[PDB]
Structure formats: C-alpha cells, structure tokens
Design a protein around this ligand. Structure first.
Ligand SMILES: COc1ccc(-c2cccc3nc(Nc4ccc(N5CCN(C)CC5)cc4)nn23)cc1
Length: 300
C-alpha cells in the first residue's frame, strides 16, 4: 500500500464523508448533514456540507469567495468553517461546516415557542449584534440578515450564517453598490438598498431592525414582514407595483407595527434602526451595549 501524512485537517476526504440527512436548498446551493468517519468505525464528527447546484464559472467564483469569507471568520456567533472536500475525483467543491442541531432561528421560533421567553429573545438579539460587530472589523457587509439566515446551536446560542451575499468594503469606501439580477428580500431592505442598490454597515443595521421585529412576532402566521407590508400596500398588488408602493411607504415614515406584547423600549430600538437617514442609525456596538444593559437591569 502507501504511507500517509496529514498536515491539513481542513481537507476532508470524499470517501470518509457519509450522508445522514438533507437539510435544505437555497437559490444556488444545497446543504446536507454528514458524518466524517476516517477511522471507518461508524463514528466521527457530524458536519454540515454545502454544494453548488451548478458550478458555472460565475457560481463557482462566488462560492469560492463565500468559502474564503467563512474561513476568515472566527467568532462564537458565526457558523464555524471546518474545511473543504474536493469530491468527484477533485472535480467538484464542497464546503464543510459545523452542524447546528436546531436549524434556522425562523423555524426554531415557530416550533419551540414552549422554550422561548423575552429573556431568550434578547439573548439572541445580543449574540446577533456581536456577530455583526465582528463582521464590521473585517469590513464585511452581510446584505441578507433575516431570522431564516441565523442558525441555532442550542437554547442559549445562535450563529449568523448565509455569507454567499457578503461584500468587502475597500478601505476608502463606506458603501458597496451592487447591481444584481433576480429576486431581492425587499421587505428586509433599507430604502437606499431598494432605490440605489447601496449596501453598507448601516443597511445591515436596518435589516437587523427587521430581524428584531421578527423575533418579537414569534414568527406568527400573519405578522411576518412580507405579510404586514402587503397589508399596508394592498394585498392584491403584484410585480413592480409592490416595489413602487413599498418605497413610497418607507420614504414617508410607513413602518412595521409594534408587535403585540413587545416592550416600548424594544420597539424604540427597531424604530431607531429604521431611520431613512443612514448616518443616524445606531452602530452594532451601540446596539449590543443597549441590549445587554436591558438584559442586565432585570432582577435576575
Ligand atoms: C438553505 O438551507 C440551508 C440549510 C442548512 C444550512 C446550514 C449551514 C451550516 C450549518 C448548518 N446546520 C444546520 N442545521 C440544520 C438542522 C435542522 C434543519 N432542519 C430543517 C428541515 N427540517 C424538516 C428538519 C430540521 C436544518 C438545518 N443547517 N446548517 C444553511 C442553509
């Protein structure tokens, strides 16, 4: 046979990666749960594995950028990069990550409400802010914050995922304009993202406000951002008319309503994130401190 030397534990061997479960599909990718069992004894770490539907030059370039981004991040509230697998005899690329048992925050909130109180919601809020502070130190703009894109390790820890839209700000620039085809999560977008395709830390703060709103609605059927905005706009509107009305609504101070049972001071945080004036939105550091002070002021 042959000798073996492993000095790159970020390279996962295809033959040792065994399928456990399908986890989901996005626009251009899918994710599976696998076991990595190099000792072939039916044991090994469980991992999440992302693969591209169609490895076009463009899709692959974007996927490699996503991998580089995730690899560059090391923080308790960001999904952990583990490595890559060069499958199909090294003619396909897969991204290996830690597996988070409770899936998306959006699904967790919907299915495990017996386990969730306002204290928990504020803990998740704080962790999301801290993850976002960390992204800011690398000049990364996420562009797709939403509860469906946050993952849940356990009762006490959530992690930001979904870095396939992330942009890197050059040192002398404060926004990134991105002209892209296809669909946008318009009900999470800042007005300047809708009108000018401009993205920035401040546009992530806007979307964070929508995330906070989502948390305090407990993902109740008719209370979602798309459901509430469509109610306001007119439920029968279709196509570009939805966008025209959403922009006009937001520009003149139309906003998502205070969720039932949501404390006025939590709604105030949302409203401050949803400032048309980009420079007046709070920073993620401001938000983390405020939320942790709210948490700490409780009797226990
Ligand atoms: C768009 O789909 C995905 C799917 C998985 C991931 C991902 C990335 C990196 C790590 C990671 N851990 C989990 N865990 C997970 C656990 C349970 C579920 N369920 C969804 C399907 N349900 C019917 C069962 C639970 C989904 C994901 N998902 N996940 C990201 C996007």
């Amino acid at each position: 046979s042959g000798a073996f030397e492993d000095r790159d534990p970020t390279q996962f061997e295809e033959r040792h990666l065994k399928f456990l479960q399908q986890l989901g599909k996005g626009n251009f990718g899918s994710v599976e749960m696998c076991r990595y069992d190099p000792l072939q004894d039916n044991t090994g770490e469980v991992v999440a594995v992302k693969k591209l539907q169609h490895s076009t030059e463009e899709h692959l370039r974007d996927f490699e950028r996503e991998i580089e981004i995730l690899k560059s991040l090391q923080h308790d509230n960001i999904v952990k990069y583990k490595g890559v697998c060069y499958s199909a005899g090294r003619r396909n690329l897969k991204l290996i990550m830690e597996y988070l048992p409770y899936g998306s925050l959006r699904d967790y909130l919907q299915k495990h409400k017996e386990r969730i109180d306002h204290i928990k919601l504020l803990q998740y809020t704080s962790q999301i802010c801290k993850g976002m502070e960390y992204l800011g130190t690398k000049r990364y703009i996420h562009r797709d914050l939403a509860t469906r894109n946050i993952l849940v390790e356990n009762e006490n820890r959530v992690k930001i995922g979904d870095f396939g839209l992330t942009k890197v700000l050059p040192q002398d620039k404060e926004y990134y304009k991105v002209k892209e085809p296809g669909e946008s999560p318009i009900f999470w977008y800042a007005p300047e993202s809708l009108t000018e395709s401009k993205f920035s830390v401040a546009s992530d703060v806007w979307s964070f406000g929508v995330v906070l709103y989502e948390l305090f609605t407990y993902i109740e059927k008719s209370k979602s951002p798309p459901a509430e905005f469509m109610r306001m706009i007119g439920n029968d509107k279709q196509g570009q008319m939805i966008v025209f009305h959403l922009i006009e609504l937001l520009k003149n101070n139309g906003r998502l309503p205070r969720p039932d049972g949501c404390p006025d001071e939590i709604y105030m945080i949302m409203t401050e994130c949803w400032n048309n004036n980009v420079n007046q939105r709070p920073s993620f550091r401001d938000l983390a401190l405020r939320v942790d002070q709210i948490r700490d002021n409780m009797a226990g």
